[PDB]
Design an enzyme around this catalytic site. Structure first.
Site, short mmCIF file in Angstrom:
data_model
loop_
_atom_site.label_atom_id
_atom_site.label_comp_id
_atom_site.label_asym_id
_atom_site.label_seq_id
_atom_site.Cartn_x
_atom_site.Cartn_y
_atom_site.Cartn_z
CG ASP A 102 -2.14 0.36 0.91
OD1 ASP A 102 -2.12 1.91 0.26
OD2 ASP A 102 -2.75 0.17 1.64
CG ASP B 246 -2.99 9.47 -3.28
OD1 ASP B 246 -3.66 10.88 -3.26
OD2 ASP B 246 -2.45 9.58 -1.40
F1 BEF Z 1 -4.82 1.53 1.62
BE1 BEF Z 1 -4.15 2.59 1.43
F2 BEF Z 1 -3.08 3.14 1.95
F3 BEF Z 1 -3.82 2.97 -0.01
MG LIG Z 2 -4.03 2.39 3.36
#
Ligand code: BEF
Ligand SMILES: [Mg+2]
Length: 1162
Positions: A490, A726
């Site tokens: 992650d 993200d």
């Molecule tokens: F769950 Be993650 F930090 F993208």
């Molecule tokens: Mg996460």
């Protein structure tokens, strides 16, 4: 047409139950048992069989085992359950049970019971609960399907339906909704000890152990078999007790209901969140601690600032808006133009604000009116919980390799038993003794202690792993960690802290140039000034542009980023709308605030300031106007744009760090503007002309351990990939800093300018000067796929689904950005279906589907070593008497086989450093055992037919040596540092089988040669009887010495040491025994001690025989090593796979780093 209309379900079938009379494990055994019982009891003419005690015991055991197998076949498989227990039904009017088969990798098979409801006078409901989903029968379609809601229909509902909704009235309709949709409850079962023990007790290995132990009850010993059964039961009880304890520690989860206001029957009532139905009007307010929104809701009025921390993964607050501004008679599409209004369940509402379409009075608690659409297990987090609980079966160490191994040994066992029985029937011996001997041969070759040894060798690794605060729930997944080909990671929470921290104030040197600012090629200022040391105007803007509200008691509510800015700035606000006092030493009270609008992007405020600078002594006072915004919007309002404005913020925003622009205006230089004149000031007058202050950069701070752990994983034969949720730019920058990817990088996405309804995918660069277009047919191989790296976003995964290029995008990509929770599971399944073993190390709820379907899944909690020490101190104090904050036992540790508790990226190598140390053991316990067992077969097949026998002392010595050497093998500890070489993954391979067969052939040939030579030197023409006592002879000594040397050699040569586990010279318990026993054997061979020969009933030796015996033992010892060595060097697979093949430049850089650190290490 399929009976069950759902993509997950493969096939279904209607069943009708049968009573106990017609079951397949009762009916044949009630007409056969009396037939034999009459013959045994009151026939007295036993000519079918002789009638001895063992002869009737054989017939008892056969029928009992057949009954047990017929009963257990209904528990092992569900197709046999449908064949035996129930019968095929015709239609719905007679069926009572249904059998459902899932797709190949989404759970396990099941049989569910139908439930009929009679809520209607002439209408009935047919439903069965599979995987906690309420499948329903629709008579029109003649098929089962999942429940349908108002928001989901082939005509999309108009906005006027939700806008004009007045809640739920007409109490009978309320009762209908309650009975049709059910209560909003999750009710995780958390199974207790009894069902866990029942599930453990029907495993094939436990049943095999019980049967093999019970077969020894042939009147030979009545006290050496019950004790073993008691020990087995005790061991299986304590194992399942430990599993139950370590499962109830973590998997115990609960959702606490909280009261809410519901507009029911035209009145606002207090209703618990457990009982909510679709169509209800709900007033949503600020959520409490550790409690999200209870149901899927769509806002109708007011605006809310929420924290989407379980879908996006980030903690940056969003800005949800209502649907009042949208006109009526409009289609409600969810993918675009209205996903800003949907309010998913399980998220936290940070703030609520209002800054009467249906004529509804406002709620007393002054929240936001909204309409609940989906509730129960059908919400967005209901699917997450369903993937937590029922997604993948346990492993339990019952793989097909063990079954093949047992069958491979059983072949030789049956051959030896056949040889013994043929000799016995030719020599006309007693049948009972022959059956005793054959049972001994059968139960001595196939090992009944293999599951015990495997369980011990895995539990010692569990006890070793418990030191580094790693706790595990499924122990038998540790051998999977030895052979890992890809390691997923992650980004937020795992490699980088989840909170946003202020990096500082940047761009303070813009405008006037000091001729010393570190610039770039494009002339962008890169100086990073800390927020502690800053000018007066910028700190006043930072302390006045915030939007914070103080309640009656004094709690502060808002975005935590301005709290983290203010506590670093040292300021503090009072009860009144004032800010009080680093190095500023002043106060400021604000008068008028504006609001973030998501279209203007401008938080502005007016205030009266007075500040006394200390370093220079300058003083400022009067009025002040502060504006904080996005740099593009702020740039237009500046009267004098600086020389390098459009370069610094571009460079900072292309690094992934969020950037904000600060501007100040002095309205009146002395005193305030005046009373009531601030009230009539307009937005287009306050924000007319301003002065620049600086750029405020916020970022998520990288951990101090990520670089070292990722370097150690990469320098081994592994491969590290990142699957985040993200933005592409921040993920690319983090991957570049951590050295996941080190080359030119091209991302696959829609163009950066927001185009809606456009399906054009274009390759982009981070610098944004390459715009190679592409279509979902085939990526260009020779240049894009080979020269430059890749970054495939989540918008291009669902457009490449099913095409020919998809199989090429799961091999040459290292990072994935903006990935939904389902697509992580999709990526991991696609990687697992190519042949690579995977590993995922997540932190939160959004990657449960990845944690569950990975081979080894680690979940990293957040907590330092000092917190664990304080928890230990508190527990010790409360135990002595017979307070510190607890660890955030969230949702990732529920669905993960492992669970760390130390918040370290270095916990991922350590698990790997243990996995090898287990797997190397688990291989050799297969190799050392079988070979030994194979020898035992020969030593009881054709050597037992000879007259050779061994004394009691020799047998005790051999047994003690075998027990010590077998107990020393399982206990092993790891060696620091990962290695470039990979252990042997699978037991069934050319190397292992070739080595075993070669060593067994060498042993057999040496035994045959020594037997023929011993018979040649002194013949034995006397008759042979198999019931005589021990008699010392030269055969009885030669065979014993050679056999003891074989038992030494099998442990001596088949041992892998330094590259993965302990060296042999350090393992005292095995090494001391090996050297002592081989010294004793050689001393007895060479006749150094005359007393030692008579000590173990060993006959004196001829001078000529001693030398040839010593040479044949030496030849055996040498050949057993040479064959294994040449087979290991020739036909073994230890190299990296195709996905981890490093380029020569990376290896050269690694070598340069190694030699440099070795040089400076002195
Ligand atoms: F769950 Be993650 F930090 F993208
Ligand atoms: Mg996460």
């Amino acid at each position: 047409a399929p009976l069950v209309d759902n993509p997950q379900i493969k096939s279904a079938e209607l069943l009708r139950p049968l009573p106990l009379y017609q079951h397949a494990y009762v009916w044949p055994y009630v007409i056969v048992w009396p037939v034999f019982l009459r013959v045994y009891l009151t026939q007295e003419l036993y000519d079918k069989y002789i009638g001895a005690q063992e002869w009737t015991f054989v017939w008892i055991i056969s029928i009992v085992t057949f009954q047990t197998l017929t009963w257990l076949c209904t528990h092992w498989s569900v197709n046999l359950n449908a064949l035996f227990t129930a019968k095929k039904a015709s239609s719905i009017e007679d069926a009572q049970l249904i059998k459902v088969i899932p797709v190949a990798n989404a759970g396990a098979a099941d049989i569910c019971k139908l439930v009929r409801d009679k809520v209607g006078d002439n209408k009935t409901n047919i439903s069965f609960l599979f995987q906690k989903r309420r499948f329903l029968w629709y008579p029109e379609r003649k098929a089962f399907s999942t429940l349908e809601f108002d928001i989901d229909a082939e005509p999309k509902p108009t906005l006027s339906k939700f806008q004009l909704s007045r809640g739920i009235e007409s109490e009978d309709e309320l009762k209908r909704l309650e009975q049709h949709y059910g209560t909003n409850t999750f009710d995780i079962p958390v199974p207790t000890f009894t069902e866990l023990f029942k599930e453990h007790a029907v495993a094939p290995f436990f049943v095999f152990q019980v049967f093999c132990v019970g077969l020894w009850l042939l009147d030979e010993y009545w006290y050496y078999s019950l004790f073993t059964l008691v020990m087995l039961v005790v061991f299986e009880s304590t194992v399942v007790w430990q599993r139950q304890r370590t499962l109830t520690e973590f998997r115990s989860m609960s959702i606490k209901p909280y009261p809410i206001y519901v507009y029911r029957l035209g009145k606002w009532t207090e209703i618990q969140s457990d009982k909510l139905l679709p169509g209800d009007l709900v007033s949503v307010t600020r959520t409490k601690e550790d409690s999200g929104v209870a149901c899927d809701m769509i806002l109708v009025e007011g605006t809310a600032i929420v924290n989407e921390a379980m879908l996006s993964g980030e903690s940056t607050p969003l800005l949800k808006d209502s649907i009042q501004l949208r006109p009526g008679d409009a289609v409600l599409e969810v993918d675009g133009l209205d996903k800003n209004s949907l309010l998913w369940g399980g998220t936290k509402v940070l703030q609520i604000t209002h800054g009467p379409a249906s004529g509804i009075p406002p709620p007393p608690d002054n929240g936001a009116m909204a309409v609940v659409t989906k509730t129960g297990f059908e919400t967005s987090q209901g699917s997450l919980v369903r993937t937590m609980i029922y997604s993948t079966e346990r492993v339990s160490a019952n793989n097909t390799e063990a079954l093949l191994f047992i069958l491979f040994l059983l072949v030789f066992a049956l051959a030896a038993s056949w040889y013994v029985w043929d000799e016995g029937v030719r020599k006309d011996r007693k049948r009972s003794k022959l059956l005793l001997d054959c049972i001994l041969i059968i139960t001595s070759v196939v090992p009944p202690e293999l599951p015990m040894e495997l369980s011990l060798a895995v539990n010692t690794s569990l006890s070793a792993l418990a030191k580094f605060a790693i706790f595990c729930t499924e122990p038998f997944r540790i051998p999977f960690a030895g052979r890992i080909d890809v390691a997923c990671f992650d980004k937020t929470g795992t490699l980088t802290g989840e909170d946003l921290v202020v990096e500082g104030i940047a761009g303070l040197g813009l405008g006037h140039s000091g001729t010393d600012t570190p610039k770039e090629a494009d002339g962008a200022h890169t100086r990073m000034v800390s927020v502690h040391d800053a000018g007066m105007e910028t700190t006043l803007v930072l302390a006045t542009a915030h939007a914070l509200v103080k309640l009656d008691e004094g709690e502060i509510v808002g975005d935590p980023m301005e709290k983290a800015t203010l506590n670093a700035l040292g300021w503090v606000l009072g009860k009144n709308d004032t800010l009080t006092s680093s190095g500023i030493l002043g106060t400021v009270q604000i008068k008028r605030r504006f609001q973030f609008s998501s279209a203007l992007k401008r938080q502005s405020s007016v205030a009266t300031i007075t500040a006394t600078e200390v370093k220079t002594g300058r003083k400022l006072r009067g009025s002040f106007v502060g504006v904080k915004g996005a740099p593009e919007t702020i740039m237009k309002m500046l009267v004098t744009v600086p020389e390098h404005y459009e370069e610094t913020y571009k460079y900072f925003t292309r690094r992934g760090s969020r950037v904000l622009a600060l501007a100040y205006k002095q309205l009146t230089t002395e005193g305030e503007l005046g009373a009531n004149k601030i009230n009539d000031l307009k937005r287009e007058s306050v924000e007319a002309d301003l002065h620049f202050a600086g750029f405020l950069v916020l970022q998520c701070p990288l951990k101090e351990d990520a670089k070292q752990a990722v370097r150690m994983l990469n320098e081994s034969s592994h491969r590290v990939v990142m699957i985040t949720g993200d933005n592409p730019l921040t993920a690319v920058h983090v991957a570049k800093e951590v050295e996941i990817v080190d080359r030119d990088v091209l991302i696959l996405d829609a163009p950066e300018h927001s185009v809606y309804g456009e399906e054009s995918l274009v390759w982009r660069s981070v610098d944004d000067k390459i715009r190679i277009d592409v279509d979902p047919t085939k990526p260009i191989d020779p240049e894009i796929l080979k020269t430059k790296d890749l970054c495939v976003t989540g918008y291009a995964l669902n457009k490449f689904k099913g095409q020919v290029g998809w199989k090429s995008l799961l091999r040459y990509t290292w990072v994935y950005a903006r990935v939904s929770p389902k697509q992580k599971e999709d990526i991991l399944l696609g990687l697992k279906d190519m042949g690579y073993y995977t590993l995922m190390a997540g932190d939160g709820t959004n990657d449960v589907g990845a944690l569950k379907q990975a081979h080894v899944g680690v979940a990293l909690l957040n907590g330092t070593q000092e917190d664990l020490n304080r928890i230990a101190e508190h527990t010790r104090n409360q135990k002595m008497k017979e307070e510190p904050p607890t660890l955030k036992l969230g949702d990732a540790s529920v669905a993960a086989p492992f669970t760390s508790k130390l918040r370290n990226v270095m916990a991922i190598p350590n698990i790997l450093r243990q996995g090898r140390c287990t797997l190397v053991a688990t291989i050799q316990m297969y190799k050392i055992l079988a070979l030994n067992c194979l020898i035992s077969a020969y030593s009881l097949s054709v050597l037992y037919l000879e007259g050779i026998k061994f004394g009691d002392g020799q047998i005790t010595i051999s047994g003690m040596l075998m027990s010590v050497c077998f107990l020393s093998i399982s206990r092993a500890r790891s060696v620091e540092g990962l290695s470039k070489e990979r252990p042997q993954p699978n037991i069934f391979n050319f190397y292992i089988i070739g080595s075993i067969l070669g060593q067994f052939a060498v042993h057999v040939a040496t035994l045959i040669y020594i037997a023929q030579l011993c018979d040649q030197i002194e013949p034995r023409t006397e008759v042979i009887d198999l019931e005589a006592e021990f008699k010392p002879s030269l055969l009885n000594s030669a065979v014993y010495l050679l056999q003891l040397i074989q038992q030494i050699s099998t442990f001596a040569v088949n041992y892998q040491g330094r590259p993965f586990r302990e060296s042999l010279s350090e393992n005292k318990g095995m090494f001391y025994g090996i050297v002592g026993v081989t010294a004793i054997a050689f001393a007895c061979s060479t006749e150094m001690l005359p007393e030692l020969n008579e000590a173990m009933k060993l006959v004196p030796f001829n001078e000529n025989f001693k030398t040839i015996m010593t040479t044949v033992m030496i030849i055996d010892f040498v050949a057993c090593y040479v064959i294994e060595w040449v087979l290991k060097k020739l036909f073994s697979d230890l190299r990296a796979r195709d996905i981890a093949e490093r380029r020569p430049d990376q290896l050269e850089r690694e070598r340069v780093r190694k030699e440099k650190e070795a040089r400076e290490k002195e």
